[PDB]
Write a protein that binds this ligand. Structure first.
Ligand code: HEM
Ligand code: HEM
Ligand SMILES: [Ca+2]
Lengths: 150, 146
């Protein structure tokens, strides 16, 4: 089923603010179930034709998986060089710099929020990490309270 | 609290990320009585001096009547401005947005006095709207629970 419309609008707004404020080329959020299964995927920075070419949606594998087992921020300067990296699928844009955080309320996990390819070729900053943590915390509030509502 | 802690956390994110001196959120019922008023940036002694809680008048009243973002270089210069009560800190720059869901608006999240005298930006407005939207879902759920 589709996400609740208020939740969807809120999460897209959060992904947009995060992407815009950290000057990332790409931004995404996975919304999960209680067993960390991806239920919804919202993103920005990739055109419709490229989305069609890629075809299958992400399973939340690789480095994204680390945000769950180690629920703290992860910054990398060459994401697909990490040993946990599963690699990009055919037609997916290549990406290098990465900033990811879990979306949580207290210890409860609701998904992941991540950004790639800071526009200046630079690594994501400490300030970028703090901003993205705060926005992920808001996303957690949104998911937790939409769920309860539904 | 539950809700109150949530709203305080959202006010803290808005105020700290935009780098404003003061931040607040008012949540009202359908007859505009204040149900929650949470804020940061003002010391307890000054709070005691102001005395009474805001009623949601002036520029905040405007935001309740017509819920859409309002950014001002000088809040006291707006035609709807009612002025501050005695002992309230002086405040100049202003950004306020509604706390809502599609069905209903519940409150207003607002910031004043961005650091270094600067006006709030379009980026600040967009960020505060995203934070407000999360608070809007929390308020909507609290009204089901209550
Ligand atoms: C636009 C924002 C996006 C960002 C920031 C992003 C980021 C990433 C990153 C960093 C990886 C590699 C993880 C690793 O190697 O461990 C990855 C993999 C992957 N991406 Fe994306 N991606 C985006 C959009 C998309 C879209 C729109 C699709 C599908 C239409 C997609 C499908 C996939 C798939 C299938 C994988 C393989 C791993 C998995 O299934 O989880 N991505 N993505
Ligand atoms: C620290 C965060 C705060 C912010 C950002 C803030 C901001 C404002 C603003 C923008 C106005 C509008 C004045 C106008 O229309 O010209 C106002 C008025 C007012 N404020 Fe505050 N304020 C804060 C804290 C407080 C506190 C702690 C109190 C008392 C406990 C208070 C009591 C009032 C009252 C009584 C008014 C008159 C209008 C009304 O009743 O709504 N304020 N404030
Ligand atoms: Ca550092």
């Amino acid at each position: 089923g589709a996400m609740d419309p208020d939740l969807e609008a809120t999460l897209r707004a959060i992904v947009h603010s995060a992407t815009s404020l950290v000057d990332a080329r790409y931004g995404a959020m996975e919304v999960h179930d209680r067993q960390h299964r991806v239920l919804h995927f919202v993103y920005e920075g990739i055109d419709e034709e490229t989305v069609r070419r890629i075809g299958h949606l992400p399973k939340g594998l690789g480095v994204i998986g680390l945000l769950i087992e180690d629920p703290k921020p992860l910054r990398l300067d060459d994401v697909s060089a990490h040993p946990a990296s599963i690699g990009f699928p055919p037609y997916h844009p290549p990406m290098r710099t990465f900033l990811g955080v879990p979306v949580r309320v207290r210890d409860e996990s609701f998904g992941t929020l991540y950004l790639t390819d800071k526009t200046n070729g630079q690594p994501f900053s400490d300030d970028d990490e703090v901003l993205v943590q705060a926005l992920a915390a808001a996303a957690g509030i949104a998911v937790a309270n939409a769920r309860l509502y539904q």
